[PDB]
Write a protein that binds this ligand. Structure first.
Ligand SMILES: O=c1[nH]cnc2c1ncn2[C@@H]1O[C@H](COP(=O)(O)O)[C@@H](O)[C@H]1O
Ligand SMILES: O=c1[nH]cnc2c1ncn2[C@@H]1O[C@H](COP(=O)(O)O)[C@@H](O)[C@H]1O
Ligand SMILES: O=c1[nH]cnc2c1ncn2[C@@H]1O[C@H](COP(=O)(O)O)[C@@H](O)[C@H]1O
Ligand SMILES: O=c1[nH]cnc2c1ncn2[C@@H]1O[C@H](COP(=O)(O)O)[C@@H](O)[C@H]1O
Ligand SMILES: [K+]
Ligand SMILES: [K+]
Lengths: 365, 365, 365, 50
C-alpha cells in the first residue's frame, strides 16, 4: 500500500533524474562522414549559428574580446552584467563596430558580429535593457537564478511587447516543464535550462534545490518543441560528449562556462603556481562577485590557450557523435536513442587500468 | 503518463546497460571437473580454436612474434594495419612459414599456423586485402570503429563475393541488434562486438557514444545466433572472470588487448621505472598513432613475462568457471545464468579489509 | 518486447543480489532488554550452541587451541584439514581431553568439549572421516568450494549412512535454492552457505562466479526451513551488524574468518611491523596454502588479543540488534524485516565528517 | 699519470678492472643496467671481527 520510498503520496518523489554521466548515445545506421556533418542550429527562433555554442554571461568568462572571438568562431557571446550600464553599452558598441579568415562567423544583415547582453529584473534593469537596445545588441538574456517567478515573466512580456520586432528575448534558467511552458506563454524567443548543475554552483548544497540536467532538458523540450522555441542547456558540461548528449536530448544550443574560462581570449590575467599556468574563475553569486549567503565559489582552472583550438576540439567531438549516430544535422541528432549506464559502466567509459603518460588534447588527466 | 526519467517518449532511453562488473555467474548443478573442461569454440563458421582467445589488431600488441605465439598457444592473432601493405604481407608469410611442444597449436589443412589480418575500408583497403589473400591469410577482419556504415557493409559484401570461399570475413565492431543483423545479412562469417569499453578508448567521453559490453553482447547474440554466426567480444576484458562472463553472455570468442600488451612476445621495448618493468600501450586512434581529435590515449602497462603463462592463467580461470557452472563445453557455458550485483557487491567480490602481502599470479594490485 | 537489460530471455539475468551493505534492520515493537536476549541457536538438527558463532576450517584460524577457546566461549570450532590424518585426529583428541570460569561452554553428553572436523571428497577423505569419527569428533563438515557437485552429494549420503547416528553432517558451500534442496535431500544435517564473499576469496574475480550473501542466505533458507535443516552463513562478515543481518536473513549460525584470525588463540607467530602487531591470514586456495590456478590470497590482519573479548564484543552487538528488533530469541530475530539502502545511505551509515581520535573497542578504523 | 710522475714505477688497479668482463663474478642487472660485484678483502663477506 505505501510508496516503496516512504509515505502514502506517490507524487512526493516526482521522478528519477538523469545527468550527463548516467547515459550514453546508442550507435545507429549511419551514412554520414564526420567531416561533412552540418552542425548549424537555431539559437533563437530568428538566429542560426554555425557552431551551437554560446559563452556564459560571467565576469570571468565573457567580455568584448571573448564575445568577438566566439562570434568569429561561429557561435556567439553574452556579455556579463557585473559592471555599470555605460561600460556594457560601450562593450556592445565595441563588438558591433569590429575577411576570409573566419568563414563561419555569425553576422546580421549589416555584416557585423552578433552579440548578446544579459539583464536582470527591475526598472533599473529596464533602463539597462533600453540602453543596450539603443547600443544595437541582437539578443537580450533575462538572467535570473529562478525564472518561474512572476517578475521574470512580466519582464519578458514587457521586453517582447516593447522591442520585440528588433531584438530576441531569452528567458532565465528553468528546470521543469511548467516553467518552460510559462516562459513560452510569456513570449520568450529562447528558453535557457538548468538550475544547479553549474561547476561553481552551490545551490544544490546551500538550498537543496536542483534538477539533473538531462531530465530537465527532456522536460523543457517536451514543453517547448510543439511551439518551436529553442532550448539552451546551460552549465554542467565538462567534455564534448556532454555537449553531444545535451544536443541529443533536444536542446538546440549549449552555453559553456568553465570550458571557456581558461582560454586566453577570456577576461582576467594569468596566474603562475609551481610553474603551471592557471586563470581565475568564479560564479556570479560568489562571495567576491557579490561585492549575504553565497551560492557559488571561487577557484582556478588550467590555462588552455587560444579559443579556436578549444572550439575546434568541441566541434570535432560533436561531429564524431553525429557520425556515430548517423545524424546528418542537429535536428536529426535531437532524435537519437539513449542507453542508461551504472557506476561500473561509468568507470568503464573512462580510460581504466592504464597509467596515462601523455595527455590527449580532447581528454585531460 | 510522462516517463519517470523525463519527457513523453518511452523509447528515448532505450535500455539499461550492464557491463562486466554488474553481473556474476550463478553456480549450477555440476558434474564437470575443471581439468577436463573442453574450451574449444568457433571463431568463424569454419574455424574452431582450441582456446577461445584472439589477440587485438593493435600495433603494440600483435605482430609476427605475437601471432605465432598465440597460434601455438591454441588461439590466434590478428596482424595490425598501421604499416605498408608489403610489410603486412611479409608478416603474414613469416607466420605461415614457421611439433609436440605445442599440442594445441592451431593449423590449417596443410599444417601451417593460422593467422588473420585487419583491413580498413576503401580502394587502398581493397588492394591490401587482395595482397593479403595472395599472401595466404586465413581470416580478414574488416576493422572499423562503426560497422553500421553503408560503406563497411558494402566492403564486407564485396569481400565475401570475391574471396568468400578462400578466407573468412569478420565484420567491424557493432553494439546493437540491428547492426549485427545488418552484418549477418551482408554475409559476415563472424560479428565483432564492442564500441567504447576499450581500456585506452575515449569514445564515450569525446563523443559520448558507447554501450556496456554485456548488453551489447546479448543483443548481438540475439541477432546472430539463429543464423549460426559466431560473436567475438572485443574490449573491456581485464580478468579471466570477464572472459567467462563474456562467453556466458553468448559470445563465442574474446579478443584481448591490454592483457597481452605486457607480454614478451608483444612488440615494443621494455621500460624500467623505479625498479619496475613496464611496456608502452597505445590505442590505434591516439594522437601518437594517428601520425586531430584523437579517440585514444597512450600509457604503460606492467610487464607480465611470457605469453604462455598468461594464456594458461586465463584458461585456468575459464576452466574454473566452467566447472562451477557445470558446463562441459563452451556451448553449454553460453546458457549459464546471471545475477545482477550492486556496488557493495562489487567491493565484496574483490578481496576486502585484508593487507595482501604477496601478489597472486592471477590477481594484481 | 526485449528485456530491458538486453536479449530476449527474461531469465538470463535471474535476479538482483543484495549483500550485507545493501540492507539495514528495521526497528520494531520491543519489550526485550539486550541483557535478557537469548542468543542460543541450532548448529545442526541435534546440536544447540549458546553463541551462534563458529570458527572457520582454515589453517591460519582454527586449531586445537582455537577450538578449545571457541567451545569454552559458547560456540564451536572446526579443525582444518591441511595436514595429515593422524595429526588431525591428534588435534581432535587434544580438544576432547581438555570449572566455573566458562559457564557457557558447549559440552556433549559426557561433559567433554564439542569440536568439528573438515573432510574432503574421495577415498582418502573417507579414511580421514573414519579416523576422525574413531577419535570422537561430533560434527563432520564436507568442506568443498562447490557443493552442488554429484561427488559431494554422494560423500554426504555415504557419511550419513555410515556414522549418521554418531555424528552430524554439514554440507559444503552452496549459493542457490536448488543446491540447498539437493544437499537437504542427500541427508545433510546442516547447510553451509556462501560462494565468493570471503575476505580472502578471489573466485568472483578469477572465475567470475559468485552470489551476494544476503540473497544466497534467503534462497538457501527458503529451501531448507520447511525441513528444519539449519543454515550456516560462511564468509563476508566484518562487524557484529553483519552477524545480526545474516541471522535475520534466516541463517541459524555464522562462521567467522578474519574476525578470529588476528586473535591470540589462532595459530601462527605474531609479526611486528612499524611498532604494531599483525598475524598471517591466508585463503585455503592461495598458492602459499596449496603447497594450479589460485582462488585466494595471503595477507596480515591486525592483532586483536584474547578470543573472549572479541566474542563478547560480537555478542554485545548481536544483543543490541535483538533489543532493537524486539526479538526475544534468535528464531524471532529470523523474522525481522529489512530496508534497502543506496550508496549515499551506505556512507551515511558509517561515521562521517568527524576526525576520530581514539578507536572504539568494537568499531575499527 | 700523476702516480707515475710522483716516482712510482707501477700502478695497481682495483675498481677500474672489477667491472670488466674478465673479472670473476656473475653479471647483475638493475633497472636494465649492468653491474658487477666489488668488495674489499676485509669486508664482512670476504672474512667468511671489525
Ligand atoms: O555563482 C553562481 N551560482 C550559480 N550558478 C551560477 C553562478 N555563476 C554562474 N552560474 C551559472 O552556472 C553556469 C556554469 O557553467 P559551467 O561552468 O559550464 O557549468 C553558468 O553558465 C551560469 O548559468
Ligand atoms: O584508439 C582506439 N580507440 C578505440 N578503440 C580502440 C583503439 N585502439 C584499439 N581499440 C579497440 O579497443 C580494444 C581494447 O581492448 P582492451 O585493451 O582489452 O580493452 C582493442 O582490442 C580494439 O578493438
Ligand atoms: O582460498 C580460499 N578461497 C575461497 N574461499 C575460501 C578460501 N579459504 C577459505 N575460504 C572460505 O571463505 C571464508 C572467508 O571468511 P571471512 O574471511 O570471514 O570472509 C572462510 O571461512 C572459508 O569458508
Ligand atoms: O678490505 C680492504 N680494505 C682495505 N684495503 C683493501 C681491501 N681490499 C683491498 N684493499 C686494497 O685497496 C685497493 C683498492 O683499489 P681501488 O679499488 O683501485 O681503490 C686494493 O687493490 C688493495 O690493495
Ligand atoms: K573506455
Ligand atoms: K571476495
Amino acid at each position: 500500500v505505501p510508496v516503496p520510498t516512504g509515505g502514502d503520496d506517490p507524487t512526493k518523489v516526482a521522478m528519477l533524474g538523469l545527468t550527463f554521466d548516467d547515459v550514453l548515445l546508442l550507435p545507429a545506421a549511419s551514412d554520414v562522414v564526420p567531416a561533412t556533418a552540418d552542425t548549424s542550429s537555431q539559437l533563437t527562433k530568428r538566429i542560426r549559428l554555425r557552431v551551437p555554442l554560446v559563452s556564459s554571461a560571467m565576469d570571468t568568462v565573457t567580455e568584448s574580446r571573448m564575445a568577438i572571438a566566439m562570434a568569429r568562431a561561429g557561435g556567439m557571446g553574452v556579455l556579463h552584467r557585473n559592471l555599470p550600464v555605460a561600460e556594457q553599452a560601450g562593450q556592445v558598441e565595441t563588438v558591433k563596430r569590429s575577411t576570409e579568415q573566419f568563414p563561419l562567423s555569425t553576422k546580421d544583415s549589416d555584416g557585423r558580429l552578433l552579440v548578446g547582453a544579459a539583464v536582470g529584473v527591475g526598472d533599473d534593469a529596464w533602463t539597462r535593457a533600453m540602453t543596450l537596445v539603443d547600443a544595437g545588441v541582437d539578443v537580450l538574456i533575462v538572467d535570473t537564478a529562478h525564472a518561474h517567478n512572476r517578475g521574470v515573466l512580466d519582464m519578458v512580456s514587457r521586453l517582447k511587447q516593447a522591442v520585440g520586432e528588433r531584438v530576441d528575448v531569452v528567458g532565465g534558467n528553468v528546470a521543469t516543464r511548467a516553467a518552460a511552458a510559462a516562459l513560452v506563454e510569456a513570449g520568450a524567443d529562447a528558453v535557457k535550462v538548468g538550475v544547479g548543475p553549474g561547476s561553481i554552483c552551490t545551490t544544490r548544497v546551500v538550498a537543496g534545490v536542483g534538477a539533473p540536467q538531462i531530465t530537465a532538458i527532456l522536460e523543457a523540450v517536451a514543453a517547448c518543441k510543439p511551439y518551436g522555441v529553442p532550448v539552451i542547456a546551460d552549465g554542467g558540461l565538462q567534455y564534448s560528449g556532454d555537449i553531444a548528449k545535451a544536443l541529443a536530448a533536444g536542446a538546440s544550443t549549449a552555453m559553456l562556462g568553465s570550458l571557456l574560462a581558461g582560454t586566453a581570449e577570456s577576461p582576467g590575467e594569468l596566474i603562475f603556481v609551481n610553474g603551471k599556468q592557471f586563470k581565475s574563475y568564479r560564479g556570479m553569486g560568489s562571495l567576491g562577485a557579490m561585492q549575504l549567503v553565497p551560492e557559488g565559489i571561487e577557484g582556478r582552472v588550467p590555462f588552455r590557450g587560444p579559443l579556436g583550438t578549444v572550439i575546434h576540439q568541441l566541434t570535432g567531438g560533436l561531429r564524431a557523435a553525429m557520425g556515430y549516430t548517423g545524424s546528418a544535422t542537429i535536428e536529426q541528432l535531437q532524435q537519437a536513442q539513449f542507453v542508461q549506464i551504472t557506476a561500473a559502466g561509468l568507470k568503464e567509459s573512462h580510460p581504466h587500468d592504464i597509467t596515462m603518460t601523455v595527455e590527449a588534447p580532447n581528454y585531460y588527466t
